[PDB]
Each structure stands twice: as C-alpha cells, then as structure tokens.
Structure 1
C-alpha cells in the first residue's frame, strides 16, 4: 500500500524549466495516466495537489503533476514582464506539450509503469480550459476533467490580451467541446463567482453531449485552500465523481 513520489525536472528553452512529480503505487503493471495541471494562482505542492495525486495513485493511476514553467520563472527571480509573458494560455499548451512528450517518450520516472494508451487530463480553474484545448488538439488524450473551469480564456497582463486576441478561433472551448468526440467532465461548485457560472451554463448549452456536474455548496477550491490539514466533503465528492467518470469512459 506504498505510494512512491519521484521528482523530476524538465529543462526548457532559455533558463525555463518544469518541476513535477510522478506519484504511483508500484505494481508490475502499466497503469492509466492522470496528468494534473494546477491553477494560475496555484502550484504543485499547494493545497490538495499532493493529496489528490496520492488519492488517485492509491486508486490505480500513474499520476503526473507539475508546476507550469511560469512558477519556476517566478521562483527563479524573473522580472514581472517575463512572468506575465509566461502566463499565457499558449504557454500552458506548450508546457503541457513538454510534459506529455517526456511521458510518451518514457523519459519520466517509472515510465515503464505508465500506460500511455490511457491518458487523461485534470485541470483546475483555467487549466480546465487550456487542458480542454490541448485535449481537442491531440489524439492521444482520451478524456479530460475540468474543476471549476472550462469556458474560453477571457488585464494587467498585455500578453494574455494579445494571446486571446490572436487565438479567438483556437481557444473557443464551446466550439471544441461540441465537436470533440472524447469525453469531457466539467465539475463546477455552486458557491463560485457569477461570471463563471454563466460561462459554465453557456458551455453546457453549446455542448450538451458532454458531462456537467455541479457541487452546490462548494467554493472555487472545494475548500482545499492551503495548507492541507484534512479533506472536505466537497473535495471528496469531486474526487469520487472524477474517478467514476474516468472509470465508466474507460470501458467504452
């Protein structure tokens, strides 16, 4: 019943990098992969991410979670313009492309026990959107789950302005959700900002093929703000729902 965490570092261009972990219960078998993208205010050790990774590893998964490279940029002392540039959706797609490449090429720790034929994505808050986009554009992503995110990327950040401006087509996740044949689960907590609940309803109208679950009394983080002293009822429901969802759409 032993959960190994294996650190890794992917080196990117300039001095950029991605720090992450593989979380896994070692048996001698390839296990379905869960790649977790944290939120734009979050990071890989914040709050419930250690717990969530371990939860899934205990329940049969090879789990990868990582810091977007803007997180390492900030922690390395980069000036605010550079972090702003690295905070775009395009940057998230690109970082995600580094992680999936290293996984598929079996370069991440313990990769022999990863079943790259069953890869799912889990995204939080705006990684929900960028994950939906990446899934839509890549054939080897079999399913994606967004926690309190998913509607199209909509600042003090001009780079985000330029990015959304030059990728209106590419990032329209209502369009993507409607045309994507792979299953998408969107979990939204009811006690969350009004604009997001309206965008969520817009998405549910655009693509009624997909799956939409609402946890009524849950905030933007299911009450799992840092530190993580214990789980909450809303987090445990999000987890049990995501697990049931990947489960049922595995044998389909």
Structure 2
C-alpha cells in the first residue's frame, strides 16, 4: 500500500542526489513533506526509512534524499571535494534542487503531490538549514526541526561558509520574524551546547513552538541500524504530525 519510488537528480559536474518518493496512492494530491537528514546521516540511515513510511501512511507525499556530499563520498570523491560539499550553503543549494524538481513535477508520482502544502522536516544541523530555507521561501508553509534549529556554528569550507553568512544563517533572527508555524522538538539527553542554543532560540522567538522530550537522545533512540521504533521517536512523530495537520492552514 506504501509505494517507494527511487529518483536521481544529476547536478553540475559529477554531483547528484539520490532520493525517494514515499506515498500511499489514492489518486489525489497529498500534502508534501520534504525530509533532510543530519550531518552524520543519509537517506537510508537509522529511522528515516521508517519515518518516511510513517508519514506516507498518515497521508503525506514524502521526499527524502541523500545530500550531494553523500553521493560524492560514495563515488569516492577527494577529501577536499567532500569537505566543500559539506557546507550549510550546499545543503540550501541541494534543497533548492529537490524543491525545484518537486515543483516542476519531475519527481515520481508528482501528480499526487500538493505543492500548495509543502513542509520541511530537518534533523540536527539540517534543522537549522531547513529553517533558513523555510524563511527564504514563501512556498514552505511550515518547518519542523528535530534536535536542531540554532544557528550553524576540521572543515575549512564550513568555516569560510559560516563566516560569510553570519547574518543569513542567524536562525534566531529568522524565527522571530517568520510568521509560518515552526516546531522545534529537543531531546533532554543531548549535548549541553545544543540545549543552551535551544533556550536562546526560545527566548529570541517565543512566537514559535518548542517541545522538549526529556529522556530522549539526539536521535530519539533511532540510531543506525533500525530494528524497531522507540517511545521517543513515536512521540516526536505524533507531535510533528499533529503540528503540521492542525496548524498549517491556520491564521
């Protein structure tokens, strides 16, 4: 009943993105959820296959994908090559490619995607990058960060990138002004630096929604490999799904 369709977007040079559309086919347009994996992840990592299917069963047209850096590394690209593809800027560029292909209806089964109702879900570092993309694109109607969100902070490319985009990447400023519904879910058993940044977000932008799951770690327990769900991932899923469905279209 859940259909999974592979796609590949060939980018410039040898860069490419492998992704999946996950969907229960009902011949109607379904709200879109585009999922971004974290810095240590990939589309087949940990809970992502489960999460993609979970949302497809709940009525979403789901896209998840390997960032460019992942396809480069599996192609055996140089260490400098992979490092420069690892910037936040490159996430935003990859995400722009994913969303352009969705909006031009080039992804599989795109006739069943409601591009008028697009949401982002970002894990860890991609929680900050998804907030940035959301803030910069009117067609993103809501964004959810899992154990991420605060501004992105051995890679010299990441240093140059963070240095040249100190204002653009300030998710604290962006969240204070973004009128779209944003949800940040944070596990209590994550590193303190992150938890500190999450309080600064909540103080900067109280208008948004902040959910803490005290006993959950940085992955809600769903690190690789994934044999079963956990209470914490299940909560994050139900809260995220309630957030999108109950608030997306509200004024």
Give the TM bin, normalised by the shorter chain.
over 0.9
2:163 equivalent in structure 1: 165
Unaligned stretches of 5+ residues in structure 1: none
1:69 offset after TM fit, Å?
Answer: 0.5
* Residue-by-residue CA offset, 1:184-234 (whole Å, 9 max, x unaligned): 000000001000000000000000000000000000000001111100000
In structure 2, relative to structure 1, the CA distance for the partners of 1:139 and 1:251 (3 Å cut) is: closer
1:56-114 Cα shifts (integer Å, max 9, x gaps): 00000000000001000000000110111000000000000000000000000000000
- Pairing 1:1-252 to 2, within 5 Å after superposition: 2-154=1-153, 156-252=154-250
Q: Distance in 1 between matches of 2:249 and 2:127?
A: 24
> Offset of 1:5 from its aligned partner?
0.1
TM-score, length basis structure 2: 0.99
C-alpha root-mean-square deviation of aligned residues, in Å?
0.5
* Superposition deviation, residue 250 in structure 1: 2.6
Q: Distance in 1 between matches of 2:79 and 2:217?
A: 29
Contact 2:189 2:216 in 1 (8 A): yes
How far apart in 1 are the matches of 2:249 and 2:20?
28
Distance 2:13 2:51 in 1: 32
Q: Could you tell me whether the CA contact under 8 Å between 2:35 and 2:120 is conserved in 1?
A: yes
Distance 1:97 1:69 in 2: 12
The answer (yes or no) to whether the contact 2:181–2:248 under 8 Å persists in 1 is no
What is the DSSP-based 3-state SS (H/G/I as helix, E as strand, rest coil) of the residue aligned with 2:62?
strand
- Deviation by residue 1:98-137 (Cα, 9 ceiling, x = unmatched): 0000000000000000000000000000000000000000
Tell me the number of residue pairs that the alignment of Structure 1 and Structure 2 aligns. Answer: 250
Residue 28 of structure 1 and its aligned partner are, at CA, apart by: 1.1
Q: Distance in 2 between matches of 1:251 and 1:59?
A: 17
Q: Cα offset for 1:247?
A: 1.0
Structure 1 residue ranges (4+ consecutive) displaced by more than 4 angstroms after TM superposition: none
Provide structure 2 residue ranges, at least 5 long, that are not aligned to the other structure: none
